[PDB]
């Protein structure tokens, strides 16, 4: 699931939760 | 009046590049234990060989235009791949290992969660694993494996067995292989006795990183061949007239356990040492070492003006490059090796036994740089090899003495005291003369 | 042992025109074995041609050699200012080696 | 095809061409890196001895060591007479030095084998 | 790639011996190379002397008992050095000379036949006077 | 096999005819094994036929089989001078298999006769 | 092709021309692929083009030249076989001759390649 | 698949002059197709009148100088159309008529040699009667 600011070619710029290297650890990415 | 004349099988050769294939020994396989090289589907078994004298004629060998030695570094970088890739991925533990931290082991023992069989349940594993392999991430300080951001690692098939076992390269129909015969061949230059052989001596695809080990010893000299003698960025390879040799063991005994992964996955973990712990080491003899190192002092001092020879220990870099680095029974090691190459000729004559330190490491990475891995299981028995030193690797130093260091792996260099004396030239049969004859 | 000659001995030209300068041997070089050079003012020569008709590496292209028995010629087409010197003609075929009488062009 | 006797002068290795033939026999299914190999020689062997007896036969030699041909010689391809080209000169040394009548060579031998099959059948009617 | 170098000039007066070496940068080794010595004339064509080629010093049948011709292939810290000396000088002696280099490693090239080649990489040449 | 002199007659390109001739595994590489294995393949099968005959090697090769009028009904006249060989070959195309089995047993029986004149 | 293999020399030797006659195929449609069964097929056409090759190859050497009856100029030395015509055309098949001197064929093989390249010499004398 | 379809019947008188088209459907160009004219008449057996192919046209000597073939390919409206014209019309000119098309792609089938054919395709009919 991406979380784009809605109302806010365009772009909406979002975020989201990603896997890191270590299984365990996540991060968030723009 | 002369007339045009055809003939077919005349002597003639030029040099050429062609797919040259294996051929090995008469016994199947290794013994029934497939290899890593695939020994057994190159077999097309070695008939008797036949060599003929060509006589009065005189032939140019370059060794660093062989396209010989660039085959064979793509072959072999292909048949390990090949035997990894039905292979267990390793993917799963590259989680937070949380490691016991603080004559000392390099153990380490460690706790880490592991899926199991069923994807919804975990476990949680403990294993000892060697602090060469383990980073510091930043008592029970965390860790994490060191080919994490670099690299996928690949678990090695079990019963597969990384025994070197001669290879022979042959040439096919309308090629010939071509070969120097001649005492002191400094690899480059005119060579007088030439002979033309079908296929290749036996090679044993070892390889190693500081001293050459189980290799083919030099005919009358030692023999200092290198790329451009003026550049320090270029390795010298050194050959031995005679062998010096070296055994290596692991002493204290271990135990292998099985854990399971995935389905039908099983990851080999190391056991508490049955027995005494004790370190490995490497035997060299004293005696023999400086004999044959100070044969190398002198011919280094014909090709370098004379001057005075230090041999110091490596300075730098990936664990390869500093240590000696083999394979002992499908366990690598790496070896120090600042006993052996500490001295100035030109001279130490101590004739004890040398012993030198060994620490083994198990997440093993591509020598090319590529970003694949592998993970080579636990062995349980105690293990023993006895080899010979037929080489030495050694680079000079940036500039009254020249410095010369020991020397890293690129695997080519390994094979290239083996292949020196070897050319493929193709056969043009066919030629035109001017006869008497005349009739269609 | 054996004697060459080149002809024209000096010429004349200006940019744009082809040259002509041919070269005699006094036996026949059946074999093909004949260089040409170009030096330009108080400078070694340079190899241009080897073996009749064979250009080497990183060489302009409108040198151009012919070779027929007795009769060897070099064509330089659309003549630069950087091409002017003097030309040689040389065997390689019997010891010793030989080399042409010497030929100049100028502007 | 031999390799051995390339030293000698082509008056010694000519006597010795019948040993060439003489003495001697003269002259997969899988995806593994040394079976691709096995395929990729096999191929290039075959093809290579058909592109010979390819060029052998047009001329109408069909398979013979020796072949005499009806093309006379031209003093343009070379010079030396028969002792000096057959007492001192080896193999190596004559293929190179006419290396640039090859194809010319070739062209004539074909022409000259055409003329003559032409010839043979007027005489049949 | 290629470069050579020779020594100084010289000028010097009959009865005394003078000699000029060339220093190659870019030759690996003179084994499988040749090196050709050919005097220019001061308004005159190009002349032959002598060679080394497979470390067997030869010279022309005009040079022969005089002229004198040595090399030393690469070492530790110079490069391949070959060297030519004019014993019993002369008047005759007034003109440039050069060290040549054509390469030898395959026979099919056609840079060289039987040794007796072509001159492929010329050093810059050294003005020798008496 | 020369085209070009293809639409000419057959006494015309007769004349005409002065000369005959003259791993990895990708996308591409496997093409081109292919291809090679079909050119090979293909010289063989010709030769293969024209040697049972005994033609080994000319280009004009002489049989002793006789014309059955059943193949052909036209004199030389018209099939050389104003018969093309794509013509010819599609107007006989139906006895090509029998001329085979023909010149196969013609060869045979020469063959034959010879080692009884050599005793 | 092997066929009628039972009847002796003598009688399986006219009937050679029905053997050489009706056509002395399968694998060769193009395919170009790396299934199962796309390789068998690449290795069948190579395997039969050998085959072929070798045995043309080693015809050519002694002067046959793709003929049936391959007549040539070599003593038959008795230690290869005692047996007199009738014994061996009247009442031996060709697998049990090809059998009985299986032990002489490389030392045939021989004899056959130098009796060839003699005969060749001899003509070029001639001829010049 | 293919099929033909002409005009209807007609009922004339001599002097006059009568025109039959046949359409094609299925048949792609008439460059690769042929168009063979063939009329019957009752009772008696089918006899040849014309043809067009590769865009020329042509009749039998008897049917000369009174017949008259034309032919247009496709057209976005259109399928392919062929016209034949009686002119001069007389009493034995009473007989139904066909079109027909043969396939020319390959000349290794067999159904065309060298412009004379086998009709695979025969169209329905356009009995004329006078
Ligand atoms: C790809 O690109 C290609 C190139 O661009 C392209 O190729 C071209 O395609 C077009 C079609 O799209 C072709 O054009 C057609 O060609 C037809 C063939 O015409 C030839 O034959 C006629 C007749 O020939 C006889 O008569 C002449 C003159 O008397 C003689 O000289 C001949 O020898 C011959 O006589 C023999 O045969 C007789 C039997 O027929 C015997 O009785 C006799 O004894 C002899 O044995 C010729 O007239 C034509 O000549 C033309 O060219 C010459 C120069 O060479 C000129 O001098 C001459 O004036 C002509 O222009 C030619 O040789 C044409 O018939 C056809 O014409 C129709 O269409 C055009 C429009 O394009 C109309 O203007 C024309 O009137 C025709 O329409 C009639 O037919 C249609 C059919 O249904 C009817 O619907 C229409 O109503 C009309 O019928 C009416 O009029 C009739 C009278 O004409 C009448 O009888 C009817 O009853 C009705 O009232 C058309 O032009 C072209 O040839 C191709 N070119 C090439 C190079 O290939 C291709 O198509 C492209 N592909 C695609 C998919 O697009
Ligand atoms: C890889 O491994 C291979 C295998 O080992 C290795 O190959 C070896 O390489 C060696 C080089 O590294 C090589 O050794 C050199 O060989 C040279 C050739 O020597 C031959 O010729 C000379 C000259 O021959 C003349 O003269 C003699 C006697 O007068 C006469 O009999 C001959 O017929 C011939 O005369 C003909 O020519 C004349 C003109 O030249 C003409 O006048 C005559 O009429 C006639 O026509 C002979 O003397 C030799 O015996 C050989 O037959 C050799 O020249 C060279 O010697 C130099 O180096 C030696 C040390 O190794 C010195 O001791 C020696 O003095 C030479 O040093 C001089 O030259 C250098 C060059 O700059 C200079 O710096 C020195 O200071 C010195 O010059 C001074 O003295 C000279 C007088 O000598 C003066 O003129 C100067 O002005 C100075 O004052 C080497 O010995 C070896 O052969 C080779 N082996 C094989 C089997 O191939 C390869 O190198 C290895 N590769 C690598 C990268 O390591
Ligand atoms: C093994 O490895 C060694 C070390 O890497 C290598 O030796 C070196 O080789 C290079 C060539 O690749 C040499 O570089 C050339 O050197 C010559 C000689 O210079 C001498 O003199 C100067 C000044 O006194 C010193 O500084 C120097 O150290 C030498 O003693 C130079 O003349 C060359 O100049 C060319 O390069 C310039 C860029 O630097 C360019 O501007 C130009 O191309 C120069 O050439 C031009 O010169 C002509 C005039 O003479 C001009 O007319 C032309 O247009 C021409 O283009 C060049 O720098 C280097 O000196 C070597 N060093 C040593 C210690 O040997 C071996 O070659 C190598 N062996 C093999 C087999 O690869
Ligand atoms: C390019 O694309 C176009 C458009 O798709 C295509 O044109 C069409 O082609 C099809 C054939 O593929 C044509 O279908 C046939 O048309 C004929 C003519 O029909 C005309 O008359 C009727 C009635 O007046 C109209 O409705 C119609 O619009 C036309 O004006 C029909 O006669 C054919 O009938 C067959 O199909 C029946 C089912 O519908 C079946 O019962 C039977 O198979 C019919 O054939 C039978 O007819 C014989 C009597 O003559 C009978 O004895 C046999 O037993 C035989 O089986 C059929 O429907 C269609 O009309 C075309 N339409 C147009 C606008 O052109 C091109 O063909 C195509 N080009 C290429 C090269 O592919
Ligand atoms: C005799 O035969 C030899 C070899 O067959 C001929 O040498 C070849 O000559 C051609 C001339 O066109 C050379 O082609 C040129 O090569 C240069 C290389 O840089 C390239 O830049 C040009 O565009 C052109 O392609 C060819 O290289 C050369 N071959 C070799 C091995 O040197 C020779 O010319 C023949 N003799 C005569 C008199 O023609
Ligand atoms: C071990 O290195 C790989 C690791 N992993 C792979 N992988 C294949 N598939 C995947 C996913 N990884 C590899 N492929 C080719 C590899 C190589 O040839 C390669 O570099 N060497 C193999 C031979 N040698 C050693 O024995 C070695 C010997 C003494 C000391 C230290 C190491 C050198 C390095 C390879
Ligand atoms: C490992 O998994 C267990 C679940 O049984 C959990 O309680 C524990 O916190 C996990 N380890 C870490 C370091 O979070
Ligand atoms: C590391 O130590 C324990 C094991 O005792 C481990 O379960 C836990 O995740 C870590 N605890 C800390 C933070 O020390
Ligand atoms: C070359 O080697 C062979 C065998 O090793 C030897 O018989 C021969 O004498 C050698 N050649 C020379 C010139 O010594
Ligand atoms: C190399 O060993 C041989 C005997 O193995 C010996 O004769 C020779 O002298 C040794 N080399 C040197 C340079 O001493
Ligand atoms: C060493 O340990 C292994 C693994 O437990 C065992 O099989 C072996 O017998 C032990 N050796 C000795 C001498 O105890
Ligand atoms: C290495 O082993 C061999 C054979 O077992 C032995 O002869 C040699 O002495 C050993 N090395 C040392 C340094 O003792
Ligand atoms: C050194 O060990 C290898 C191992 O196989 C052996 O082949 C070789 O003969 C040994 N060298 C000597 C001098 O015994
Ligand atoms: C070439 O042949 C001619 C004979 O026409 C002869 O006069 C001349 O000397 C020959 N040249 C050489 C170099 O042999
Ligand atoms: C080769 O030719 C030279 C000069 O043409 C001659 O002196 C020499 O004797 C010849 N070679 C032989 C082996 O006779
Ligand atoms: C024509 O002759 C051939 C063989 O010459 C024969 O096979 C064929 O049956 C003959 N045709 C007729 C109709 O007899
Ligand atoms: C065709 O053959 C018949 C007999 O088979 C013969 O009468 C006729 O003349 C032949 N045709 C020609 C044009 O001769
Ligand atoms: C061949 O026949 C066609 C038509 O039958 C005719 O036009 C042509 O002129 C004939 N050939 C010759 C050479 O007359
Ligand atoms: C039989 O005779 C042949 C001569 O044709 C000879 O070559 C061969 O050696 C002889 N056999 C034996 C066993 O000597
Ligand atoms: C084969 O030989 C035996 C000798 O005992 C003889 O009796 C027999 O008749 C022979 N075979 C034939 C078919 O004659």
């Not at chain 2, 063991?249 to 190391?270: A, C, D, E």
């Not at chain 3, 003609?89 to 030989?98: L, S, W």
Request: with cysteine; hydrophobic share 35%; charged share 20%.
């Amino acid at each position: 699931t991406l979380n784009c600011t809605s109302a806010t070619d365009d772009v909406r710029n979002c975020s989201f939760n990603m896997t890191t290297e270590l299984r365990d650890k996540q991060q968030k990415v723009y | 009046n002369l007339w045009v004349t055809v003939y077919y099988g005349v002597p003639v050769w030029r040099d050429a590049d062609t797919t040259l294939f294996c051929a090995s020994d008469a016994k199947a396989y290794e013994t029934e234990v497939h290899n890593v090289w695939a020994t057994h589907a190159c077999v097309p078994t070695d008939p008797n060989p036949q060599e003929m004298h060509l006589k009065n004629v005189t032939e140019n060998f370059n060794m660093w235009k062989n396209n010989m030695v660039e085959q064979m570094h793509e072959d072999i970088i292909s048949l390990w791949d090949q035997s990894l890739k039905p292979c267990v991925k390793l993917t799963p533990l590259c989680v937070t290992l949380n490691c016991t931290s603080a004559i000392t082991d390099d153990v380490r023992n460690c706790s880490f969660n592991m899926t199991t069989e069923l994807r919804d349940k975990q476990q949680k594993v403990y294993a000892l694993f060697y602090k060469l392999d383990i980073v510091p991430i930043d008592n029970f300080s965390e860790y994490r494996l060191i080919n994490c951001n670099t690299s996928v690692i690949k678990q090695a098939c079990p019963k597969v067995s990384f025994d070197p076992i001669p290879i022979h390269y042959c040439t096919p129909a309308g090629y010939a292989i071509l070969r120097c015969n001649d005492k002191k061949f400094n690899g480059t230059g005119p060579c007088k006795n030439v002979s033309s052989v079908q296929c290749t001596h036996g090679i044993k695809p070892v390889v190693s990183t500081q001293l050459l080990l189980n290799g083919s010893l030099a005919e009358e000299g030692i023999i200092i061949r290198s790329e451009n003698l003026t550049n320090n960025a270029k390795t010298i390879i050194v050959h031995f007239n005679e062998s010096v040799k070296i055994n290596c063991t692991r002493p204290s005994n271990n135990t292998r356990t099985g854990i399971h992964i995935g389905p039908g996955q099983v990851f080999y973990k190391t056991g508490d040492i049955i027995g005494d712990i004790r370190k490995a080491y490497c035997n060299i003899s004293g005696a023999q070492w400086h004999k044959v190192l100070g044969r190398v002092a002198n011919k280094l001092k014909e090709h370098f003006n004379n001057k005075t020879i230090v041999f110091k220990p490596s300075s730098g870099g990936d664990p390869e490059i500093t240590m000696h680095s083999f394979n002992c029974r499908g366990e690598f090691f790496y070896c120090n090796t600042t006993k052996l190459f500490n001295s100035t000729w030109g001279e130490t004559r101590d004739n004890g036994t040398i012993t030198i330190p060994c620490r083994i490491k198990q997440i093993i990475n591509m020598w090319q740089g590529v970003g694949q891995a592998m993970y080579a299981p636990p062995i349980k028995g105690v293990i023993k090899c006895l080899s010979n030193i037929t080489g030495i690797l050694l680079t000079r130093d940036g500039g009254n003495n020249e410095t010369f260091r020991p020397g890293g792996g690129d695997m080519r260099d390994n094979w290239r005291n083996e292949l020196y004396k070897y050319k493929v030239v193709q056969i043009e049969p066919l030629g035109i003369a001017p006869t008497k004859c005349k009739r269609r | 042992d054996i004697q060459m000659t080149q002809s024209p001995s000096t010429l004349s030209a200006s940019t744009g025109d082809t040259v002509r300068i041919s070269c005699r041997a006094s036996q026949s070089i059946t074999g093909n074995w004949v260089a040409w050079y170009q030096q330009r003012p108080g400078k070694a020569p340079r190899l241009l041609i080897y073996r009749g008709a064979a250009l080497l590496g990183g060489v302009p292209s409108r040198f151009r050699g012919s070779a027929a028995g007795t009769d060897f010629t070099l064509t330089i087409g659309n003549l630069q200012a950087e091409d002017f010197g003097t030309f040689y003609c040389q065997q390689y075929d019997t010891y010793p080696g030989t080399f042409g009488q010497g030929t100049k062009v100028e502007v | 095809g031999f390799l051995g006797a390339a030293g000698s002068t082509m008056g010694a290795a000519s006597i010795t061409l019948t040993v060439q033939a003489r003495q001697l026999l003269s002259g997969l299914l899988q995806l593994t890196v040394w079976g691709i190999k096995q395929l990729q020689a096999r191929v290039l062997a075959v093809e290579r001895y058909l592109q010979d007896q390819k060029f052998l036969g047009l001329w109408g030699c069909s398979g013979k060591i020796i072949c005499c041909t009806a093309v006379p010689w031209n003093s343009s391809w070379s010079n030396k007479t028969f002792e000096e080209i057959w007492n001192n000169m080896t193999w190596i040394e004559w293929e190179r030095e006419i290396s640039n009548y090859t194809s010319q060579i070739y062209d004539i031998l074909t022409i000259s084998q055409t003329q003559q099959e032409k010839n043979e059948k007027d005489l049949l009617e | 790639q290629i470069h050579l170098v020779q020594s100084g000039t010289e000028v010097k007066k009959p009865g005394s011996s003078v000699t000029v070496s060339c220093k190659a940068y870019g030759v690996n080794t003179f084994g499988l190379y040749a090196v050709n010595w050919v005097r220019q004339a001061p308004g005159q064509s190009l002349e032959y002397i002598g060679q080394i080629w497979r470390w067997k010093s030869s010279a022309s049948h005009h040079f022969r008992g005089r002229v004198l011709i040595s090399a030393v292939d690469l070492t530790g810290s110079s490069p391949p050095i070959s060297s030519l000396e004019i014993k019993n000088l002369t008047s005759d002696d007034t003109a440039v000379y050069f060290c040549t280099t054509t390469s030898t490693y395959d026979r099919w090239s056609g840079l060289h036949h039987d040794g007796v080649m072509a001159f492929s990489s010329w050093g810059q040449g050294t003005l020798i006077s008496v």
